[PDB]
Amino acid sequence: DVSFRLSGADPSSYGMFIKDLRNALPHTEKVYNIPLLLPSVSGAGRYLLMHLFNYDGNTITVAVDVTNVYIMGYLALTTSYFFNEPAADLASQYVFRSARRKITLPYSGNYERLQIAAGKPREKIPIGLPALDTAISTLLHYDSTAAAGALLVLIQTTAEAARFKYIEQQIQERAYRDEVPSSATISLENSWSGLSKQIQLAQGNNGVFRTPTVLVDSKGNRVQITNVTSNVVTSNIQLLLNTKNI
Ligand SMILES: *[C@@H]1O[C@H](CO)[C@@H](O)[C@H](O)[C@H]1NC(C)=O
Secondary structure, eight states: OEEEEOTTOOHHHHHHHHHHHHHTSOEEEEETTEEEEOSOOOGGGGEEEEEEEOTTSOEEEEEEETTTTEEEEEEETTEEEEOSSHHHHHHTTTSOTTOSEEEEOSSOSSHHHHHHHHTSOGGGSOBSHHHHHHHHHHHHSOOHHHHHHHHHHHHIIIIIHHHBHHHHHHHHHTSSSOBOOOHHHHHHHHHHHHHHHHHHHHTTTTTEEEEEEEEEOTTSOEEEEEETTSHHHHTTBOOBOOGGGO
């Protein structure tokens, strides 16, 4: 368990939640000083439970695969909800078995299918701590269209912030006012797998990527990352997806 309370939340307590989230993910090595997530984990140890409390103190518990930071499903009162995909179905064998009923959401967890279900891309969905409080409250009342948008908010404010310090900082800036994610934020989210792969390939290649990774920077400009000396590698990314899962 890691925990976050929106009641009384500020940039510091959110920082501590994101720190806790990162520290709960097991790893045996660092690659260029960045934790390398495990190739796999067998049984219930695969999944971390995040306890989130909205402002009024209602709670959901979110199940996260510790090898890839993917949200598999969540529990809200006595009802469990899982994405419609095999990994989630497998997770439902291990978490929230005490739920009185289990609902399978009518989409998978990937951004493309979530955006379809929600009626909108995530460029247009404001994120922040208030949006996170809203998302928690939404997931309490099954509505599958509303839940898709809530889940885009949740994934970005939790998993994506764990992966990148820049995104954590973006959410901290939106502690008391939501705002659509920066282009750079979207870019990083979409590049995580690729960055993770190229950082791993750079080991044995003198710190140079085999294939450059294109990102958008904080001013809106398209930039190529070619090696591990980039600030994206030294001072941004916090977790690497294992190339075994790429
Ligand atoms: C790698 O990227 C840096 C930016 O960090 C750039 O200035 C430099 O020319 C590149 N160095 C190598 C060894 O490719």
